[PDB]
């Protein structure tokens, strides 16, 4: 008997990773062929879920916790001889005190920095690794958690764009009340 999980989480590591990379100037990728059509009106077009949410939180994280993050990225020096263990360790402590969206996003970034550091050392080859190491920890040290707090749908409904605006809707309203009161 055996069993596994989904892949969504993994998609986050890739999508985000790329973002953290592009933000630094890097990128790298490839193309291919499949099969599809279209006939309406092409344009940027954007979503409004984990993708957008995750990113934002990431940028704001290093902003509010510029130090809390920096000091972290300096706690682990990824290398070819580095063992996935040395990784799951550092991330463990930062996650020792229970689990909360905050630490979650604050964590994701940790990895992003690792990649930025790898490329800086002309070792982008690592990116692929750290990327897999995350999807492994997120599915063995978070999955069970994220599924106990309403998955991501909740994270995007709390500390997310559509959510941010939603919050204001109320406030701007409440204030109007006391005023008319």
Ligand X SMILES: O=C(NS(=O)(=O)c1ccc(NCCSc2ccccc2)c([N+](=O)[O-])c1)c1ccc(-c2ccc3sc(CCc4ccccc4)nc3c2)cc1
Instruction: Name the site residues for ligand X (rule: CB under 6 A).
Output: 57, 60-61, 64-65, 68, 72, 75, 90, 93-94, 100-103, 105-106, 159
Q: Under the phi-then-psi rule, with left for phi > 0, alpha for psi from -120 to 50, and beta for the rest, what region is 45?
A: left
Nearer residue to ligand X within complex by CB, 119 or 160: 160
Q: Under the phi-then-psi rule, with left for phi > 0, alpha for psi from -120 to 50, and beta for the rest, what region is 33?
A: beta
Minimal distance in Å, beta carbon 34 to ligand X? 35
Distances (CA, A) of 22 to 1, 7, 115, 122: 42, 23, 11, 15
Minimal distance in Å, beta carbon 140 to ligand X? 18
Nearer residue to ligand X within complex by CB, 97 or 122: 97
Q: Give the C-alpha separation, 155 to 20, whole Å.
A: 20
Nearer residue to ligand X within complex by CB, 124 or 157: 157
Minimal distance in Å, beta carbon 40 to ligand X? 34
- Give residue number: closest CB to ligand X: 102
Nearer residue to ligand X within complex by CB, 164 or 174: 164
Minimal distance in Å, beta carbon 12 to ligand X? 14
Helix, strand, coil content of the chain in percent (nearest 5): 60, 0, 40
Helix/strand/coil for 169: helix
Nearer residue to ligand X within complex by CB, 16 or 61: 61
Cβ-proximal residues to 76 (8 Å cutoff; 6+ apart), any chain: 86, 87, 90, 114
Minimal distance in Å, beta carbon 135 to ligand X? 19
């Amino acid at each position: 008997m055996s069993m596994a999980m989904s892949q969504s989480n993994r998609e986050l590591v890739v999508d985000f990773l790329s973002y953290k990379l592009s933000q630094k100037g890097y990128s790298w990728s490839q193309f291919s062929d499949v099969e599809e059509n279209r006939t309406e009106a092409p344009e940027g077009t954007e979503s409004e879920a984990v993708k957008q949410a995750l990113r934002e939180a990431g940028d704001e994280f290093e902003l509010r916790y510029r130090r809390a993050f920096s000091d972290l990225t300096s706690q682990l020096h990824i290398t070819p001889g580095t063992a996935y263990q040395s990784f799951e360790q550092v991330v463990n402590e930062l996650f020792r005190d229970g689990v909360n969206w905050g630490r979650i996003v604050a964590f994701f970034s940790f990895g992003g920095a690792l990649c930025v550091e790898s490329v800086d050392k002309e070792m982008q080859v690592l990116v692929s690794r750290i990327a897999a190491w995350m999807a492994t920890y997120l599915n063995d040290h978070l999955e069970p958690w994220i599924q106990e707090n309403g998955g991501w749908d909740t994270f995007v409904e709390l500390y997310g764009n559509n959510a941010a605006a939603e919050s204001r809707k109320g406030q701007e309203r409440l204030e109007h009340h006391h005023h008319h009161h």
